[PDB]
Amino acid sequence: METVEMVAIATVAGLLSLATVTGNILLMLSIKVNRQLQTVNNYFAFSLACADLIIGAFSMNLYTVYIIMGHWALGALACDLALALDYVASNAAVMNLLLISFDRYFSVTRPLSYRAKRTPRRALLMIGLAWLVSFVLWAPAILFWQYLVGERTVLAGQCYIQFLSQPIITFGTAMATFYLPVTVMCTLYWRIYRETENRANIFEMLRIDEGLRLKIYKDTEGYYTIGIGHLLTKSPSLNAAKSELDKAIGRNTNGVITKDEAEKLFNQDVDAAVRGILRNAKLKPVYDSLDAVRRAALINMVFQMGETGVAGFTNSLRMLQQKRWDEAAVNLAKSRWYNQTPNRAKRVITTFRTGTWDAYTFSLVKEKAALRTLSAILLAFILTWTPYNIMVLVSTFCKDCVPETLWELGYWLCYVNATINPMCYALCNKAFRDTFRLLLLARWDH
Ligand SMILES: CCCCCCCC/C=C\CCCCCCCC(=O)OC[C@H](O)CO
Ligand SMILES: CCCCC1CCN(CCCN2C(=O)CCc3ccccc32)CC1
Ligand SMILES: CCCCCCCC/C=C/CCCCCCCC(=O)O
Ligand SMILES: CCCCCCCC/C=C/CCCCCCCC(=O)O
Ligand SMILES: CCCCCCCC/C=C/CCCCCCCC(=O)O
Ligand SMILES: CCCCCCCC/C=C/CCCCCCCC(=O)O
Ligand SMILES: CCCCCCCC/C=C/CCCCCCCC(=O)O
Ligand SMILES: CCCCCCCC/C=C/CCCCCCCC(=O)O
Ligand SMILES: CCCCCCCC/C=C\CCCCCCCC(=O)O
Ligand SMILES: CCCCCCCC/C=C\CCCCCCCC(=O)O
C-alpha cells in the first residue's frame, strides 16, 4: 500500500470513528442530563449506544490498523480477544434492537398488564441478559475452537474466526444474527402499526362523543376526573386527585395534562374495558365476531353506560353476532340511551350499521416519535448489514466468488450502523435533537 493510500484511509476512517464516538456519547449524555429522556425504552437506547461506542472506539480503529498495515501484527492472543470483542458488541447491538421492538410491542398491544411489569429494574435485567447471552454465544467458540480441533489453522498475520470454516456455518450465524431478527422485527412493527391505527381511531371516536378535558374536573357523581372519563379518586379532595394524577403520569402535572398523556390513560381504560367484555358471558361472543370498527362502537357503548347496561341489549347483541346490522339498528334506537344522547347514539348506531367511520370524519394515523424512531433504527440495521449478509449468502452457492476487498467494504458498511443509529434518534425525537445541540454548543463555549 502506497503512502497516499495509507493517509486517505486513516483520515476517512478516523473521521468516521470520531463521528461514531461523538454521536453515541451524545446519546448517552442526553439520557443522563435530561430527565424527560429517562424512560424505560431509552434504557435499551443507552445499552445500544454502549455497543455502538465499542464499535466506534475499538472495532473501527483496530480494523483501520489491520487494513493500512495489510496484516495482523499484534499476535494470536490479541487476534482472538479483538474478534471476541467485535462479535460480542455487534451481537449485543442486535439483541438491544430486539429488546426495543419487543418492549414497544407489549406496551402498545397490552398497555395495562405489561405497564405493571415495565419498570427500570426489569429493563436493567433484560439489558444485562442480552449482553451475557452475546458473550456466552461467541467468546467461548472464538477462543477455544483451536483447542477442540487440535490446531490453530489461522496463519500469523491473519485474523479471522476458525470455527467458521464452511460458508454454510457462517450462513447459520447470518440466519441467527440478521435474517431471523429482521423477519421478527418487521412482523412486530407491522402489529405495532396496526394496533396504533386501531387505538387512535377509538381515541378520536370517544373525543367527539364523550369529550376531552386537559384539566381536573368533577363527573356526574362528583368525583375528580381527567381526559376522557378517567376517574382519579373517589375522595373529596383536589390534592388527593393531583397525587393520583402525578403517580399515573410521572411528573408534577398540578391538575393540567397533555393530549398524549390523556391518550396514554385512555388506552389503559380501553384494555380494562376489553378485559371486562371478554369476562362477560353476554358480551364476549358478539365482540369476538365483530370487526375492528364495530368493536370500537361496542367499547364506546361500554364507556357510556357500563358492562351491565350494554349486556341488557340481549336481542340487539344477538342480531349483531348474526351480522343483521339494519335490524340491530332498530332495537338500539328504541332505548332510553337514544333519548338521553340522540346525536352520540345515532353516530354509534350508524357505525354498527355500516362498519366504517362515516358518522365521524377521521384523520390519518399520526405516527408518534416512538413508532417513527423504531422504523428508522430497523431500516438503518437492514441498510448497513444487508451487504455483508448477502456476501455470506453468495459464498454458500460459490466458494470464492466474494473477493477480500468486498468483505472489507461489507464490514465497513456494517460498522456504519453505529454511526447512523444516534442520527435516527436526533431526526425522529425532538427532545434528543435539542439535548444534542445543547451539549455540542456548551463544549464549543468554552
Ligand atoms: C440452522 C441454523 C440455525 C438457525 C438459528 C436459529 C436461532 C434463532 C435465533 C434468533 C431468532 C430471533 C428471535 C429473537 C428472540 C431470541 C433472542 C435470542 O436469544 O437470540 C440470540 C440471537 O443469536 C441474537 O442474534
Ligand atoms: C454478530 C454478527 C457478526 C457481525 C460482524 C462480524 C465481523 N465484523 C468485522 C471484523 C473485522 N476485523 C477483521 O477482519 C480482522 C480483525 C479485527 C480486529 C478488530 C476489529 C475488527 C476486525 C463486522 C460485524
Ligand atoms: C480511501 C478513501 C475512502 C473512500 C470511500 C469509500 C468508497 C469505496 C471504495 C472503493 C474502492 C476500493 C477498491 C480498490 C481496488 C483495489 C482492490 C484490490 O485489488 O485489492
Ligand atoms: C469513555 C466514556 C464514555 C462513557 C460516557 C457515558 C456516561 C456514563 C453514564 C452514566 C449514567 C448516569 C447515572 C444514572 C444511573 C441510573 C441508574 C438507575 O436506573 O437507577
Ligand atoms: C468495555 C466497556 C463496556 C461495557 C459493556 C456493558 C454495557 C452495559 C450497559 C449499560 C447499562 C445501561 C444503564 C441505563 C442507563 C441509565 C440512565 C438513567 O436513567 O439515568
Ligand atoms: C426472556 C429472556 C430472553 C433473554 C434476553 C435477551 C434479549 C433478547 C430477547 C428479547 C425478548 C425480550 C422480550 C421480553 C420477554 C417476553 C417473552 C416473549 O414473548 O418472547
Ligand atoms: C449465561 C450464564 C451461565 C451460567 C452458568 C453457571 C452454571 C451453574 C448454575 C447455576 C445457576 C443458578 C443461578 C440462578 C439465579 C438465581 C435466581 C434469580 O434470582 O434469578
Ligand atoms: C439517519 C441516517 C440517514 C441516511 C442518510 C442517507 C441520505 C441519502 C440521500 C442522499 C442523496 C443521494 C442519492 C441520490 C440518488 C441517486 C440515484 C441514481 O443512481 O441516479
Ligand atoms: C473475551 C473478552 C474480550 C477481550 C477484549 C479485549 C481486546 C483487546 C485486545 C486487543 C488490542 C491490543 C492492544 C494493543 C497493544 C499491542 C502491542 C503489541 O503487542 O505490539
Ligand atoms: C475486556 C472485555 C471487553 C468487554 C466485553 C463486553 C461483554 C461482556 C459481557 C458480560 C458482562 C455483563 C454486562 C454488564 C451488565 C450490566 C448492565 C445492566 O445490567 O444494566
Residue numbers in the entry: 20 to 219, 1002 to 1161, 354 to 439
Article excerpt on this structure:
Based on its high expression in areas such as the hippocampus and cortex and the pro-cognitive effects in pre-clinical animal studies, the M1 muscarinic acetylcholine receptor (M1-receptor), one of five muscarinic receptor subtypes (M1−M5), is widely considered to be a key or mediator of cognitive function and thereby a target for the treatment in AD. To facilitate structure determination, a thermostabilized receptor construct (termed M1-StaR) was generated in the presence of the agonist 77-LH-28-1. The M1-StaR contained twelve amino acid substitutions including a tryptophan to alanine substitution at position 101 (W101A3.28) that was predicted to enable direct access of small molecule agonists, including 77-LH-28-1, to the orthosteric binding site of the M1-receptor. To promote crystalisation, the last 22 residues of C-termini were removed and residues R220−F355 in the third intracellular loop were replaced with T4-lysozyme (T4L).
In this structure, 77-LH-28-1 is very well defined in the electron density map and is primarily held in place via the charge-charge interaction from the protonated nitrogen within the piperidine fragment at the center of the ligand to the negatively charged aspartate (D1053.32) side chain. This piperidine ring system breaks apart the “tyrosine cage” seen in subsequently published muscarinic antagonist structures. Toward the apical side of the receptor, the tetrahydroquinoline-2-one moiety of the ligand makes hydrophobic contacts with W9123.50, L1023.29, Y852.64, and Y822.61 as well as with the disulphide bridge between cysteine residues C983.25 - C17845.50, thereby linking transmembrane domain 3 (TM3) extracellular loop 2 (ECL2). The tetrahydroquinoline-2-one oxygen further makes a water-mediated hydrogen bond with the hydroxyl group of Y822.61. In contrast, the water-mediated polar interaction between 77-LH-28-1 and Y822.61 observed in the crystal structure is not stable in MD simulations. The pentyl moiety of 77-LH-28-1 is flexible, adopting alternative binding modes between Y1063.33/W1574.57 or between A1935..43/Y3816.51 in the major pocket. The broad range of binding site volumes sampled in MD simulations is consistent with the relative flexibility of the M1-receptor:77-LH-28-1 complex compared to GSK1034702 and HTL9936.
